[PDB]
Amino acid sequence: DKLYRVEYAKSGRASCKKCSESIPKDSLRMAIMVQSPMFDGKVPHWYHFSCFWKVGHSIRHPDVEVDGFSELRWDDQQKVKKTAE
Amino acid sequence: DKLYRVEYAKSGRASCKKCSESIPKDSLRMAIMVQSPMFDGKVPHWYHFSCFWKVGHSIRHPDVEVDGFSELRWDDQQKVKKTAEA
Amino acid sequence: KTLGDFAAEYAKSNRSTCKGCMEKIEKGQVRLSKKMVDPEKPQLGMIDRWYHPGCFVKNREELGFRPEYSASQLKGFSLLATEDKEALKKQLPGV
Amino acid sequence: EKTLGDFAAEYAKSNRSTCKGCMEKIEKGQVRLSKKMVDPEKPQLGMIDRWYHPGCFVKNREELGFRPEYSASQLKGFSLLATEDKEALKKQLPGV
DNA sequence: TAATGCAACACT
DNA sequence: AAGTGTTGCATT
Ligand SMILES: [Zn+2]
Ligand SMILES: [Zn+2]
Ligand SMILES: [Zn+2]
Ligand SMILES: [Zn+2]
C-alpha cells in the first residue's frame, strides 16, 4: 500500500509509459501506483529504470517510500538510492 | 538398420506421407526407411499409426522387423503386435 | 452507427470460455462479446467476455443489448460471412 | 522470366541466422543473399537456404556458382527490395 | 493491460 | 524436411 513499487519484470509483456517500449523479462522496472476508475484500486504504471526518473519522481528515501525495496539486491538498492539522491 | 522404425514423435513438426497432416509431439508414428539420393543413407517416411497400415504394408513379426520396438511403453508394443496381423 | 462495446468475430481459438454457460467455444465458431470489466481481473480491465450467439441472446436484456440496436450494428460484423450475418440478424433483430 | 531459381535475396527475418561466408551472425533487417544448396551437415533436409552477407557472397561469387552471366536483378525476391538496396547489389553483382 | 499458456515462425 | 530455439498470438 505504498506510492511506488519496484521489482524484476515478472514478464516481458510490460510496457514503459514514457517511451512506450517493452520491458525485458528480468529488467529493473519501477511503477507509480495510480487509482483505477474501473474498480477502485491501485494499478501499476511501469517505467524503465531510466524512464522512471525521467517523468519526474523526486524520492527522498526509496527504502521506505518504494514497496518491495528490501527484496532487491544491495547493488541495485544503492543504485536506486543514489539515483534518487 | 531395419526396414521400419517406431517411436514417440520427438517433435510435432513431422508430417504423415498419407494424409499430409501434422503429427502430435508424442503420438505413435511409424516410418518406412527409404534410400536417400542426398547423403547415401536411409531416411524416415513418417506416417500416423492408422495411416501407416493404410498404405498397404503387411508386417509378420513387428518385434524384429521394426526398429525401436522394444524401446517403448509396454502398453504400446502390444498394440503394435495386435494391429499387426490386422 | 455500430456499437462500441459489442463485437462479433470467429473464435480465434478453442480455449475461450462462454460466460453464458461456462463451456468452451470451439475455434471458427461465431462468438459475441461485451466490453466490460472482469470482476476477477479488474486491473486490465475493460476487456472482452465472450458468449455463444445463443447464450448471448438469452441474456440480451441483462447484458444491456437494448432492443434499439440490431445485429448489424455489431463491431466487426462486416467481416462476417453471409450465412452468418443473416443468422445473427434473425437472432438479434432491431425494432 | 529471367530470374534465377537457386539464388535469392531478402532482409534478415531475424538476427539468429549465420553467414556461411564468415561464420558470424546476420543482424535482422540486413540484406542477405543465399544459394539453394544441400547443407552437408544436414543432407536429410535436402536443398535449403544458406545465407551470406552481400560482401561475403560476392567474395565467393565463383565458388558459389554465380556466373558472370547473371546479375543482381535476376535474384529471386529482388523486386521486393528497396531502391538504395537494389542499386547497391547492382554494383556488387554486375552482369556482363 | 500484463501474466500465463499455447501456437507458429525462423534456421537449419 | 523435421528438431530446436525463439517470437509472437490468444485469453483473462
Ligand atoms: Zn521506457
Ligand atoms: Zn496420416
Ligand atoms: Zn455459451
Ligand atoms: Zn558474412
Side-chain angles (χ1 to χ4, degrees), chain A residues 1-39 41-53 55-56 58-59 61-71 76-78 80 84, chain B residues 2 4 6-17 19-53 55-59 61-70 72 74-78 80 83-86, chain C residues 2-4 6-95, chain D residues 2-96:
Chain A
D1 293 9
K2 298 181 180 181
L3 183 53
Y4 307 96
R5 179 200 285 105
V6 66
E7 62 177 356
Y8 310 100
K10 246 168 299 178
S11 179
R13 310 214 61 229
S15 61
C16 178
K17 289 297 182 300
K18 168 56 184 177
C19 55
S20 298
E21 301 293 350
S22 180
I23 301 181
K25 183 183 174 59
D26 280 323
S27 181
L28 185 58
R29 60 176 184 179
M30 296 187 60
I32 309 177
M33 304 308 299
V34 67
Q35 182 63 228
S36 183
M38 311 302 299
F39 73 98
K42 268 59 176 56
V43 231
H45 271 233
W46 300 108
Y47 293 94
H48 288 104
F49 181 79
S50 62
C51 297
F52 180 87
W53 314 99
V55 299
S58 181
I59 280 66
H61 304 271
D63 49 12
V64 293
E65 300 181 80
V66 180
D67 189 8
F69 181 94
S70 58
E71 292 186 354
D76 291 341
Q77 291 173 340
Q78 296 297 341
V80 174
Chain B
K2 298 181 180 181
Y4 307 96
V6 66
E7 62 177 356
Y8 310 100
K10 214 180 192 314
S11 179
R13 310 253 304 137
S15 61
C16 179
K17 289 297 182 300
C19 55
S20 298
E21 301 294 350
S22 180
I23 301 181
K25 183 184 174 59
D26 280 323
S27 181
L28 185 58
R29 60 177 184 178
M30 296 187 60
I32 309 177
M33 304 308 299
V34 67
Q35 182 63 228
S36 170
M38 309 309 308
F39 64 98
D40 177 11
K42 267 58 176 56
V43 56
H45 271 233
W46 300 109
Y47 293 94
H48 288 104
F49 181 80
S50 62
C51 297
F52 180 87
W53 314 99
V55 299
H57 277 82
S58 179
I59 279 66
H61 304 271
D63 49 12
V64 293
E65 300 181 80
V66 180
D67 189 8
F69 181 94
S70 60
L72 48 69
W74 178 280
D75 308 339
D76 294 282
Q77 48 192 11
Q78 239 70 26
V80 178
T83 58
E85 33 77 3
Chain C
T2 61
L3 314 189
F6 291 93
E9 71 183 22
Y10 298 100
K12 297 183 178 183
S13 67
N14 64 337
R15 55 185 190 273
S16 63
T17 304
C18 166
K19 304 304 174 59
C21 52
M22 301 307 303
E23 61 185 354
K24 293 300 178 61
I25 307 179
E26 302 184 10
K27 181 177 182 180
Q29 289 288 359
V30 181
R31 62 180 182 181
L32 304 177
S33 68
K34 69 164 303 178
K35 306 296 177 58
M36 61 167 296
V37 178
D38 191 327
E40 296 180 353
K41 301 177 183 178
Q43 61 281 350
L44 289 178
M46 198 72 159
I47 62 179
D48 265 316
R49 306 183 78 258
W50 302 96
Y51 313 90
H52 296 109
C55 302
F56 181 92
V57 300
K58 189 178 185 62
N59 299 266
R60 189 183 168 126
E61 178 182 353
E62 185 170 353
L63 289 179
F65 196 83
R66 302 290 189 82
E68 285 63 68
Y69 336 113
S70 62
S72 60
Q73 306 181 25
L74 290 174
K75 177 175 175 295
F77 176 87
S78 64
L79 305 179
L80 297 175
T82 300
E83 60 179 355
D84 285 330
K85 292 178 182 297
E86 315 301 326
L88 299 175
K89 298 176 61 178
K90 291 187 175 182
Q91 296 173 341
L92 292 171
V95 59
Chain D
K2 52 72 172 295
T3 62
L4 282 29
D6 60 336
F7 291 93
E10 71 183 22
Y11 298 100
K13 297 183 178 183
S14 67
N15 64 337
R16 57 183 186 268
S17 64
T18 304
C19 167
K20 303 304 174 59
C22 52
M23 301 307 303
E24 61 185 354
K25 293 300 178 61
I26 308 179
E27 302 183 10
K28 181 177 182 179
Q30 289 288 359
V31 180
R32 62 180 182 180
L33 304 177
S34 68
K35 184 192 185 304
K36 268 58 180 294
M37 60 170 296
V38 182
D39 188 308
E41 300 184 359
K42 290 188 177 183
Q44 54 278 172
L45 307 177
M47 269 188 169
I48 62 175
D49 265 316
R50 307 183 78 258
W51 302 96
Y52 313 90
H53 296 109
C56 302
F57 181 92
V58 300
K59 189 178 185 62
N60 299 266
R61 191 209 245 243
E62 178 182 354
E63 186 170 353
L64 289 179
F66 196 83
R67 302 290 189 83
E69 285 63 68
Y70 336 113
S71 62
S73 60
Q74 306 181 25
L75 290 174
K76 177 175 175 295
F78 176 87
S79 64
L80 305 179
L81 297 175
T83 300
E84 60 179 355
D85 285 330
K86 292 178 182 297
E87 315 301 326
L89 299 175
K90 297 176 61 178
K91 291 187 175 182
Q92 296 173 341
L93 292 171
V96 59

